[PDB]
Amino acid sequence: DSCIQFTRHASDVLLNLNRLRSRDILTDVVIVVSREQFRAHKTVLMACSGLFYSIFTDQLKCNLSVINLDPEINPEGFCILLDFMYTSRLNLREGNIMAVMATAMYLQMEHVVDTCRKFIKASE
Amino acid sequence: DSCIQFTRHASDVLLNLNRLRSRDILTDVVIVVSREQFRAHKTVLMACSGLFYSIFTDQLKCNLSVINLDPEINPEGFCILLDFMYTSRLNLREGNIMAVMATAMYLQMEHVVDTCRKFIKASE
């Protein structure tokens, strides 16, 4: 069923979560990538990334306020993926597709990986 | 704009936030309505409700783990609105529209209020 649905709701929720992120409101984690720091909400990171879901469902790790990622991870690539988590928008460019696909494979973000391949398989 | 967008992303994020809520994963607040308890995430409540946004941006209130709502609030009405926050789906019925519109006006949920009126203005 009887339920009615508000089409822009899920996107409106995301818009607000990103405004809370930009204003540093109720952010509970710091992600460190090559000496650069990214403040986020653990639940948004879990909802998006299979890696972060594994990290925050771990009895010891769920308690950490700071998470250091693999040193190979480019901070720009991570920043472009953190923005996608919060906006549904991916700033995919020829200059960053390699760095962004490598960051999405690591974070277990299947849909980013999928399209990332398609753009290079068409570029070749 | 150059950005590409994944259409189901925002809804997929919401689907996962609701699965975390159902499994009681990283829930940080307890909402009390007429002796009944609702476990949620403060950021989702803020993203949806103008009342909860005011509560969790308040220097003293943001620190509370338990929030007691006005006694007039029906727990079923609140439960139906908490489900809408997490799913974008509203279980609107003739038997609950009065209790659900009164709960949406209090929580400052303009879009629920708007449609709630429309259904009664057409019922009269």
Partner: peptide, 5 residues
């Protein structure tokens, strides 16, 4: 917005 899902 509201629609039938």
């Amino acid at each position: 917005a509201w629609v039938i899902p």
